[PDB]
Write a protein that binds this ligand. Structure first.
Ligand SMILES: NS(=O)(=O)c1cc2c(cc1Cl)N[C@H]([C@H]1C[C@H]3C=C[C@@H]1C3)NS2(=O)=O
Lengths: 49, 10, 49
């Protein structure tokens, strides 16, 4: 999110604003992304290393 | 067809 | 699932059949369980060892 204009960018913006249908991509499952688009059960696990 | 968005990262 | 009877047992069986509201349990997210009950996002990661 842009902090003031309150529009999404990126691939999450492409899904919210109807441009695309599915984001088969390394998109991290976060809280603030979950509220505006649904996420699958995660297909790959990772962490800080 | 279905639009699959993704990004160019190896 | 029971074989030849098609009746769930156990903790999944209590949620499908309405006797329980929520399962805070070591309950493994699998395929056939997802078709009858919704899971949350995972809260621990593991494997068969
Ligand atoms: N080998 S791996 O780390 O790429 C990997 C990682 C994961 C796998 C399977 C593999 Cl092979 N499945 C799990 C799945 C099982 C249930 C719990 C989370 C999803 C639904 N997600 S995960 O924990 O993100």
């Amino acid at each position: 999110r842009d902090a003031d204009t309150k529009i999404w960018n990126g691939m999450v913006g492409e899904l919210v604003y109807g441009k695309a249908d599915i984001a088969i991509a390394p998109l991290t499952i976060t809280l603030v992304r979950e509220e505006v688009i649904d996420f699958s059960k995660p297909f790959m696990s990772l962490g800080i290393s | 067809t279905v639009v699959v968005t993704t990004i160019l990262e190896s």
